[PDB]
Structure formats: structure tokens, C-alpha cells
Ligand binder design. Structure first.
Ligand SMILES: [Mg+2]
Ligand SMILES: [Mg+2]
Ligand SMILES: [Mg+2]
Length: 888
């Protein structure tokens, strides 16, 4: 099996492995890559699910809305083709409905393909890359999914291990396997072929597994397993509906079910009325089909897809790259934001440096040792190390002690940073003295941890013993430096260290202390304004720092966040979850936090129902990012932070996040606005047809006219995603609602029903009789009868289109429709083009081909009066609805 091959990989020599895998020291070849792809596998994760194109399409094609449209198609085909009288066939409606069914199915399939959960990277806007060596292309960076068995991969600091790897060349490689086995302790990896039966292969020496993070050093590895064959692939499990979020799919399904409920209430009523009143069941079937067609917002999926695409493109242009379509929903409902202070609030650059001795006087030797440690560090370089390097380089012009430090020294061993010890050690050997060069250990870390391993102190050019009094004095000086906001670091040296074969954590003892290193980290000028803007939109900002509480308090004092309440890690460790929820909800500053503590805080905040998003860019932040509803990182972050994040920003600041949140809320606002408007507009007309069915001697409007009306209305409403949105709607996060649509329909549609009845009366009694003659004296079947019916249909058609388009401005905004809130240019112009085009429709021969007749001039003043009198009623009912419920 897979396991048997892993043992061979971890036990074979490098040349036998090369011969078996057909891999040379310079990479793979094209033909062998193809053979491996068609024999071993592809580095794609199925997560326990697999579906072909046919199965996926069939599954996507059976959404409720497509079933509605298919039922409409079946009814139309039965009524117009099979059960219709010979000589009269109207396949236009059937053809257009079938085409619309196909379009809706394709759009639903696209949405399903591009929608995922748990920060799934389905859009592929940004993809992580790994360094892969090949025979012809040399060293190139390729996406993780393109890695095959046998490829030689170079691992650096921060790069996530992309598959199961057997290391063939390791240079002090330390791997953080916390993302796999939960152990936050880095493990040293060697290239030796260990012939020992390690426990369960997971904690072995010369194997690097998928999903593990590289902390320090550079290593060359050979891929042995990809895809589901790795340990990470087996651990990859799909948790269906892990979050209680109501995605756009669920909202669309709820809207479709509301439409089905209304159809079941109404269509049989019309059928019964006509069948038991007029006695011709064919006319009843025609009326039922007409009502069913009218109730359907036929091009709803097209508008939904347009809204989603506009949201995605707009957020991408706003330096906010998303991972899937559910990311917009995740980000819009943000309620509490948690992040570390470094990089986000404070600019990532030191503006003031103090390399001080024990007593706080400026010293050069401490800076020299710190520069050696920083420059010869092989791991990730933070702001402090970069500031150390820049200061040392700047001071090299006048100081001969600092000259040539980057060329006469060589690293031989190193122990990377870890949150359980908070120190970094690098062993440095001189390159200009040969074997007798003598080796110097250099250790750098936080003052409290660095004071527990030092027994000597370099003071006044001489070394003295470390008494508790000196330790207390050093801690007092460190606290005093932390008072102003400077970050304090201690530096120590040791000579000689233990040999590299036995150099471990136990060797850090009896070091002599040089002094402190103070760095000033000032906050950005725009931090306060961004924080206030975020707090305006209901997003509370909490800080989860691992640094000293004094520095975080100093930063929060300038930024503006509360500083009276500060919580440390020990208190959270000693207090239970039930009190933790309250104490975290009532606080804003957290300091001295371990990564597991940050994950616990995020989980506790999420337990109270708050949608909490975590912002991070480091390896140790992966647990918090995975435990939060939304994950935010930067494009320059480590691969693990980017992979586990739901949203990736190109800039590390809060204004971009605020703009992304605004756009995410705007997308849903526009979608629900269009849905409610179209639903109410359809319901009013269909209720009118229901009421006036028993009183009218003919059909108020044909099915084809209704379908054309809906098509033109939706092509005019495709500009919804480009209209202005009220700030009061975007201030608070919003969740999907279904009964609100039903209430809106029931409370708005009957307002238009009265005026549609009025238009029925006017056309049947005033205009059409004046043009053609009284209906009671008109012999059925003649040309004049056909003209009467066509004129009535055209009149109600034009009136309905004008009403539906012009109620958009009144319904959309709960304020005054023109004096206080204004509609955007694109929606207005597109609506006007739709109105004008459809009004030209009856006059052309195409209108006469489907049963429309040219309107008389006298009709238009009545249309204007009807529009105005409808607008006043819509305003009154909008006021009543706002007073009753409070939102639209
Ligand atoms: Mg990389
Ligand atoms: Mg070692
Ligand atoms: Mg209407």
C-alpha cells in the first residue's frame, strides 16, 4: 500500500530513491512527469467527495427554480402544442421557456462549481507556489496542485510543505508540525537514512509531511506521495454544513419555495373560478398558465449571478482578493474583528533604535552581537531583525568594530524561535581563522525569558555574577523602557558552546548578558480614522497580542481603543469558558497570549453567535485563522496563513478591510432589493388577473406578453448591482430572510392590484370602445373583435411595464425618493432604455405578429395620471410598512 512505500522512502539511500523514482538531482523530465501523473496520481484533494461532469450537471440541474421553469415548460407545451386545436400552434413560448431553463441550469451549475465552504480556494484568483526543480525549466515556482511524485522541491522559511517529502539535503531544517499533529514544538529534520522503526511514521526524522510548516533553514526534498495518499489527505474530511450560515443558495431556495406557496394558493383558485363560471376548461387552463408564468421572476438566477460577479470584481479591484463566492457572505456578516497589533495598527518599520548597555548607556558590542544573530538567522526576519541590520549597517561607516561582520563569520548551528521559550540561538564561527577560529553562541529573546538562563553580566567592561538584586534591577529597567512603548530585547553570548552533535535547548545556560535593544514602533496616521470607521459599521476591533501588556496599552492609548481593561494569558488559563465568554465580550485588549489561547478566545467569542474574523500573517496564527468564521491575511504572508484565510488583501491595513465589508454588505443589499421589488411587482399583477378573471369576458393578457414583460423588466433590472445603497442599510450586518419577502409582497402588491383593475376598467369601457365600438354590440370572431382584444392587451401591457419600472424609484428607498436619496445613473438610464424599447415594441410589426396593436394618442395622458396616482399610493403604503416593521 501507501505505507509500505513510505517505509522504503524513509529507509532507502538517495541514489536508490533516484533510480526508483526516475528522478535525477536536477529534477524530473517531461515523459517521466507524464508517466507519474498517469500512474501515481495528481496533487488534488478530493476531501472524501468525487463527482464527474455529468453527475455534477445533473445535480445542479434539479434546483427548485429550474423545476419551476420545467413545469411551466411542460404546461405550455401541453396547452399550446398537444392539446391545442389543429392549425393554431405557438411554439414561441415553449422554445423561450426551454432556453431559459437551460440558461438557469448552466448558471446554477457555475455558481455551485465556484461556491465552497471553509475558505475553499475555488476561484483561483491567487494561488500559492512552491519552488520545484525540473530538467529543462530549472528552478521555477508552480502551483501546489501541479506537484507530482518524484519532483525535487526546495523548502525555505515560511513555505508550506506541499506533499510527503523525504529530505535528501537538510541544513538545520526545523519544521512546525502543529498544523498536522497539534505539537507547536519545531522538530529537526535530517537527510540520513534512519533504519529505525519510528512510532507511526508521523514523528520521524527524514520525512516531511503535507501541511507542515517550515520555520528555518533550507532543505531539498523528493515528493513521494501526492493527492489523498498522504496523511493530510486522509485527515482532509468534509464537514457538511459546518457553519450555520445561510448562503445565497439557501436564500434563493427559500424564495423559490415562497413562490411555490403563492402559486399553490392562487393558480388553482383561478382555474376553479374560470372552470365553474365560464364553462370552458381550456380558457381556465390558459388563465392558470398565465398566472403561473407571471408569478415567476423568470431571470432571477441571471441577476443573482450578475450580483455575485459584480461583488467579486469590485472587491478584487479594491485590493481584496477572495477565495470563493461564499466569502462575500462570510465577510458581510462580520461582527467582531480580532487581530495582532503588529503590521495592522502599527507601521512595520522602526523609527528609533537604542542599543544600550546594562545601565542604559549606548553600547556598540551589544549591537554587534545582535547584528550577528539577525544577519546569520536563517528563519523569517521580523521588523526588529531588519531594524537591527539597518542600524548596524548605518553605524559601520565610523565604527571599525562593526566593519566586515557579514563576511568573516559563518553559521554552524541554530535553534529557531518558539513560543514556549521565546528565544533564538545562533552559533557563529569565524571564517578567517580556520579550525582554531573558536565558536560563539549568540542568543536573543524577551527579557523575562532571557534572564532565566544568564548567570553572568558584562558590566563596565568586565563580567560579574548575576545576583537576584541585579536581576530585579534589570527587570526594572526593562519595564521602564516598556513604559514609553519601546520593545525590549536582551542579547547574550556564550563561548564555547557544546559540539553541534549535542547542541540542544539544554545547552542554553551560563550566558553573559550584553544589554538591551529598544525599538520604537509608531502607529499609522490613518489607524484612528480606520478604527472609528470600522466601529461605525458595527465591527468591534479586539487585539490578541503576544507582547508585553504595557506596549499594547501604549499603542491603544494613541489609537483610541479602551485601555482600562487588559487581560493576560494566565487569567484566561485560570478561568473557565462560561466566564471567558463574558470577560472577552466585555474587553478589547488581550496580551501575553499563546497561539492556543488566541484560538480559544476566538472560539469562545464565536460560541456566543458573534461572527468573528481573525487577521494574521504568521505560522503560529494558523490555529486562530482556522477557528474563526472568516480568515484574513496579506499576500506577503506565509503560505499557511494565506491557505487558511477566507479573504486575502494586497495591503495590510484596515481601510481596505472596511471597503471589502461595505462591498460584501452592498451585494446582499442589492440582491434582496431586486428580489423584493420583482416579487411584489409580479404579485400585484397576478392578483389583478385573479380578481378580474371572473368579470372579464376574455384574457387580460396573453402568456407571451407576460413572458416578454418579465424578460424586458429583468433586462432593465440587470443594473441593480450598480445603484446607490442607503448607509443605514449597510451600517449593520444582515442575514438572509424569507418571511420578509412574503410580508413585502402581501403589503405592496395589492396597491398595484387596484390600479391594474382601474386600467382594466378604463380600457374596457373608455378607450377601446371609443376606438372600435362597444363590446356588447361586437360580434365575436370578426376582425373588430380581434382588434378589440389586441388593443386591450397592448394597453394593459404598456401600463404594466411603465408601472413596474417607475415603482423602482419609489420602493427602493425608505426615505423621500428624490429629495433625500437619489438613484444611480446606470440603473436609471437602463430602466429608461427598457421603457422606451418596450413602448416602441407594439407599434412595430413584431408587436402585430404576436397580437399587439398600435395605441391611440389619447391613452398616454391616462397612463401618466395612473403612474402619478400609483406613486402617491406607493408612498403612503411605504410609510405604513416602515412604521409597522421598520425596514424595507
Ligand atoms: Mg513560497
Ligand atoms: Mg543540530
Ligand atoms: Mg404591475
Amino acid at each position: 500500500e501507501i505505507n509500505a512505500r513510505l517505509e522504503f522512502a524513509k529507509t532507502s539511500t538517495k541514489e536508490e530513491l533516484f533510480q526508483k523514482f526516475k528522478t535525477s538531482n536536477k529534477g524530473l523530465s517531461e515523459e517521466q512527469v507524464e508517466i507519474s501523473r498517469e500512474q501515481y496520481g495528481d496533487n488534488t484533494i478530493t476531501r472524501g467527495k468525487k463527482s464527474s461532469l455529468i453527475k455534477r450537471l445533473y445535480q445542479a440541474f434539479i434546483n427548485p427554480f429550474t423545476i419551476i421553469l420545467f413545469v411551466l415548460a411542460l404546461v405550455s407545451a401541453f396547452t399550446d402544442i398537444i392539446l391545442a386545436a389543429p392549425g393554431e400552434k405557438n411554439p414561441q413560448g415553449l422554445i423561450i421557456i426551454t432556453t431559459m431553463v437551460l440558461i438557469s441550469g448552466i448558471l446554477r451549475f457555475v455558481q455551485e462549481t465556484r461556491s465552497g465552504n471553509a475558505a475553499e480556494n475555488l476561484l483561483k484568483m491567487i494561488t500559492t507556489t512552491t519552488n520545484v526543480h525540473r530538467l529543462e525549466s530549472g528552478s521555477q515556482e508552480i502551483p501546489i496542485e501541479e506537484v507530482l511524485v518524484g519532483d525535487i522541491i526546495h523548502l525555505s522559511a515560511g513555505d508550506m510543505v506541499p506533499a510527503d517529502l523525504r529530505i535528501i539535503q537538510a541544513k538545520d531544517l526545523f519544521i512546525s508540525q502543529a498544523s498536522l499533529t497539534g505539537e507547536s514544538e519545531p522538530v529537526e529534520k535530517l537527510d540520513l537514512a534512519t533504519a529505525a522503526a519510528a512510532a507511526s511514521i508521523t514523528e520521524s526524522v527524514n520525512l516531511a509531511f503535507m501541511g507542515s510548516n517550515v520555520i528555518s533553514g533550507s532543505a531539498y526534498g523528493v515528493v513521494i506521495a501526492t493527492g489523498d495518499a498522504t496523511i493530510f489527505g486522509e485527515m482532509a474530511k468534509s464537514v457538511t454544513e459546518d457553519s450555520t450560515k445561510t448562503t445565497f443558495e439557501k436564500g434563493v431556495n427559500s424564495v423559490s419555495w415562497v413562490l411555490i406557496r403563492f402559486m399553490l394558493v392562487m393558480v388553482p383558485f383561478v382555474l376553479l373560478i374560470n372552470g365553474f363560471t365560464k364553462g370552458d376548461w381550456m380558457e381556465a387552463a390558459l388563465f392558470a398558465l398565465a398566472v403561473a408564468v407571471g408569478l415567476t421572476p423568470e431571470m432571477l438566477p441571471m441577476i443573482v449571478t450578475t450580483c455575485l460577479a459584480k461583488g467579486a470584481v469590485t472587491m478584487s479591484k479594491e485590493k481584496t482578493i477572495i477565495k470563493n463566492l461564499n466569502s462575500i457572505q462570510n465577510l458581510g456578516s462580520m461582527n467582531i474583528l480580532c487581530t495582532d497589533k503588529t503590521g495592522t495598527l502599527t507601521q512595520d518599520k522602526v523609527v528609533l533604535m537604542r542599543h544600550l548597555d546594562i545601565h542604559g548607556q549606548e553600547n556598540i558590542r551589544v549591537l554587534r552581537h545582535g547584528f550577528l544573530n539577525s544577519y546569520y538567522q536563517t528563519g523569517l526576519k521580523n521588523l526588529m531583525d531588519l531594524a537591527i541590520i539597518e542600524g548596524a549597517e548605518a553605524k559601520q561607516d565610523k565604527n571599525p568594530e562593526l566593519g566586515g561582520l557579514s563576511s568573516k563569520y559563518t553559521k554552524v548551528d541554530e535553534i529557531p524561535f518558539d513560543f514556549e521559550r521565546r528565544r533564538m540561538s545562533v552559533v557563529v564561527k569565524s571564517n578567517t581563522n580556520g579550525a582554531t577560529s573558536k565558536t560563539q553562541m549568540i542568543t536573543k529573546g524577551a527579557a523575562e525569558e532571557m534572564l532565566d538562563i544568564c548567570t553572568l553580566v558584562e558590566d563596565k567592561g568586565n563580567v560579574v555574577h548575576l545576583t537576584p538584586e541585579l536581576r530585579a534591577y534589570i527587570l526594572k529597567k526593562v519595564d521602564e523602557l516598556n513604559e514609553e512603548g519601546m520593545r525590549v530585547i536582551l542579547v547574550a553570548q556564550k563561548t564555547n558552546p557544546s559540539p553541534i552533535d549535542t547542541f540542544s535547548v539544554q545547552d542554553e545556560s551560563e550566558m553573559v548578558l550584553m544589554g538591551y535593544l529598544a525599538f520604537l514602533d509608531p502607529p499609522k496616521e490613518s489607524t484612528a480614522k480606520a478604527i472609528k470607521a470600522l466601529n461605525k459599521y458595527g465591527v468591534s476591533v479586539k487585539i490578541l497580542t503576544g507582547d508585553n501588556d504595557k506596549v499594547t496599552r501604549s499603542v491603544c492609548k494613541q489609537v483610541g481603543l479602551p485601555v482600562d481593561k487588559t487581560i493576560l494569558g494566565s487569567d484566561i488559563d485560570q478561568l473557565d469558558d462560561n466566564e471567558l465568554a463574558a470577560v472577552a465580550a466585555a474587553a478589547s485588549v488581550f496580551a501575553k497570549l499563546s497561539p492556543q489561547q488566541k484560538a480559544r478566545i476566538v472560539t469562545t467569542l464565536r460560541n456566543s453567535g458573534n461572527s468573528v474574523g481573525y487577521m494574521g500573517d504568521g505560522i503560529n496564527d494558523a490555529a486562530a485563522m482556522k477557528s474563526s468564521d472568516v480568515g484574513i491575511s496579506v499576500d506577503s504572508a506565509v503560505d499557511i496563513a494565506k491557505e487558511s484565510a477566507d479573504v486575502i488583501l494586497l495591503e495590510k491595513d484596515l481601510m481596505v478591510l472596511e471597503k471589502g465589508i461595505i462591498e460584501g454588505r452592498k451585494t446582499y443589499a442589492n440582491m434582496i432589493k431586486y428580489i423584493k421589488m420583482t416579487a411584489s411587482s409580479n404579485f400585484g399583477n397576478m392578483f389583478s388577473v385573479l380578481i378580474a378573471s371572473a368579470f372579464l369576458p376574455f384574457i387580460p393578457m396573453l402568456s407571451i406578453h407576460i413572458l416578454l414583460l418579465n424578460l424586458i423588466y429583468d433586462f432593465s433590472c440587470t443594473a441593480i448591482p450598480w445603484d446607490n445603497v442607503d448607509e443605514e442599510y449597510l451600517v449593520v450586518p444582515r442575514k438572509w430572510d424569507a418571511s420578509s419577502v412574503s410580508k413585502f409582497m402581501l403589503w405592496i402588491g395589492p396597491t398595484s392590484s387596484v390600479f391594474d383593475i382601474t386600467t382594466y376598467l378604463l380600457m374596457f369601457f373608455v378607450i377601446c370602445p371609443a376606438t372600435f365600438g362597444p363590446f356588447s354590440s361586437l360580434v365575436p370572431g370578426s376582425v373588430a373583435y380581434i382588434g378589440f382584444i389586441a388593443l386591450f392587451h397592448t394597453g394593459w401591457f404598456v401600463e404594466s411595464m411603465w408601472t413596474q419600472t417607475l415603482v423602482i424609484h419609489m420602493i427602493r428607498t425608505p426615505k423621500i425618493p428624490f429629495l433625500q436619496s437619489r438613484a444611480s445613473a446606470p440603473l436609471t438610464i437602463l430602466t429608461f432604455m427598457g421603457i422606451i424599447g418596450l413602448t416602441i415594441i407594439p407599434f412595430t410589426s413584431f408587436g402585430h405578429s404576436i397580437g399587439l396593436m398600435a395605441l391611440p394618442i389619447n391613452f398616454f395622458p391616462w397612463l401618466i395620471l395612473t403612474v402619478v396616482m400609483y406613486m402617491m399610493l406607493v408612498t403612503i403604503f411605504k410609510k405604513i410598512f416602515v412604521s409597522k416593521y421598520g425596514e424595507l
